[PDB]
Design a binder for these strands. Structure first.
Ligand SMILES: Nc1ccn([C@H]2C[C@H](O)[C@@H](COP(=O)(O)NP(=O)(O)OP(=O)(O)O)O2)c(=O)n1
Ligand SMILES: [Mn+2]
Ligand SMILES: [Mn+2]
Length: 427
DNA sequence: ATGCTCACACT
DNA sequence: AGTGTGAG
């Protein structure tokens, strides 16, 4: 029986990333309830990142700033930069590259979002397991690590609980067995503290981390003790951990699939899936899903950490909800060129920095009356980094979508535009 | 009437 | 090639 303990995998995720990025630049926002918002003039703007002090009052993402101000009257706000009539995230991307580069010096990372990367420490761990002989791992190596499920058996504040668990774990450590998966997790964890201190020391950003044996468990583990702590989730913590873990909380189970898992099987918690045979799960959700479900509810997941620090695509979009929809064609030309211009500015940076060029341009739109995030995706060739050509070509491949027989108008009105550069190739 | 993204599977 | 799902 292969037991999902071959790998040592960490997920590092920045604590309230956009807020921290603003708080480093505006020190008065530090250690105070703040949020970041986009576009201030509708309802104060929508909230895309919330500090932990603001979360104490009930402030969340997707809220409008004016509503958040009602929960938390003393709340401070930073507005994302605006350029060419639209949001501009350059600041946060550039902060992310800071974090990704540091992480890159320790091991091969898979960038999973603007603020998180997976790292595979299998190799680094065994190299460390030679470097310090066969000597103990002191608690002072894990000053911010929690051991999930510990303490157990026979102090009422959180750091007390942390210590007792870490003491229990370390006391139980089979130092003599460079084979044992729990020892490897521990050594992985020692590396992640170093990795995390390097991030805060070199960027001023704080973050959390999950250390386990696969991408999914490390993701779950990272969120258990946010902010500014890291959590080790061992194979043996899984049964109790999943026994009350709602299905929706596992990566990729938070949408329709997890909902059908709950409806069809009539269960609630991750651990309840172990009841079912693999074929049974493959009966209800297909070969790959039933397989993945069957092994995931036992802590086993085989998705690898992909060596990928650079995005596979560079994209640019703006929504036009309500009466703001675009319904003249000269209006569609202008915003197309607004988007093409930022894309060109970002593509030029990418080729200079990363020795690659995008070869295919994707143009996507939504139209008032449709329901789905995109209403239509079309493609063309990306041959010159010129905003005027990309926008012109973006128009050409969608101009037939105009139902309206009038020359000047555009109906149905367009509720979104999306340009994405892709199919990168070494240059 | 939240925004703006990014990866991936299916077909 | 184009759609849909899941995510931060
Ligand atoms: N729906 C979302 C989710 C995140 N983001 C951006 C801003 C977030 O700060 C940044 C990182 O997202 P996140 O890790 O999911 N949450 P954040 O880092 O803000 O706080 P934590 O909850 O991770 O501490 O992505 C976004 O713009 N739209
Ligand atoms: Mn984060
Ligand atoms: Mn994140």
């Amino acid at each position: 029986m292969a037991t999902g303990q071959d790998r040592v995998v960490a997920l590092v995720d920045m604590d309230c990333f956009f807020v921290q990025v603003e708080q480093r630049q505006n020190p008065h926002l530090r250690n105070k309830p703040c949020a970041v918002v986009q576009y201030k003039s509708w309802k104060g703007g929508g909230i895309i990142a919330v500090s932990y002090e603001a979360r104490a009052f009930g402030v969340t993402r997707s809220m409008w700033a004016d509503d958040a101000k009602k929960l938390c009257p003393d709340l401070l706000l930073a507005q994302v930069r605006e350029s060419r009539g639209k949001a501009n995230l350059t600041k946060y991307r550039e902060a992310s590259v800071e974090v990704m580069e540091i992480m890159s010096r320790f091991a091969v990372i898979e960038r999973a979002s603007i603020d998180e990367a997976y790292v595979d420490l299998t190799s680094a761990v065994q190299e460390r397991l030679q470097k310090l002989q066969g000597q103990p791992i002191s608690a002072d190596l894990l000053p911010s690590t929690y051991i999930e499920g510990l303490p157990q058996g026979p102090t009422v504040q959180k750091e007390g609980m942390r210590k007792q668990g870490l003491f229990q774990w370390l006391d139980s450590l089979q130092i003599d067995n460079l084979t044992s998966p729990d020892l490897q997790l521990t050594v992985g964890a020692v590396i992640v503290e170093e990795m995390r201190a390097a991030i805060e020391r070199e960027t001023g950003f704080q973050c959390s981390a999950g250390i386990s044996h696969n991408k999914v468990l490390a993701k779950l583990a990272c969120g258990l003790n946010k902010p500014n702590r890291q959590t080790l989730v061992s194979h043996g913590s899984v049964p109790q951990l999943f026994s009350q873990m709602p299905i929706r909380k596992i990566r990729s189970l938070g949408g329709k699939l997890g909902a059908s898992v709950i409806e069809i099987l009539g269960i609630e918690y991750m651990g309840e899936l172990t009841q079912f045979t693999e074929s049974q799960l493959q009966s209800h959700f297909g070969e790959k899903n039933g397989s993945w479900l069957y092994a995931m509810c036992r802590g086993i997941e085989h998705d690898p950490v992909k060596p990928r620090q650079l995005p596979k695509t560079i994209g640019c979009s703006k929504n036009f909800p309500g009466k703001t929809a675009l319904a003249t064609r000269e209006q569609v030309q202008w915003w197309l060129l607004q988007l093409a211009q930022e894309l060109e500015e970002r593509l030029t940076k990418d080729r200079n920095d990363n020795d690659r060029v995008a070869t295919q341009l994707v143009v996507s739109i939504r139209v008032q009356g449709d329901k789905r995030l995109s209403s239509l995706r079309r493609c063309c060739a990306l041959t010159r980094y010129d905003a005027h050509k990309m926008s012109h070509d973006a128009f050409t491949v969608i101009k037939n979508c105009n139902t309206s027989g009038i020359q000047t108008e555009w109906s149905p009105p367009l509720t979104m535009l999306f340009l994405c550069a892709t199919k990168f190739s070494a240059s």
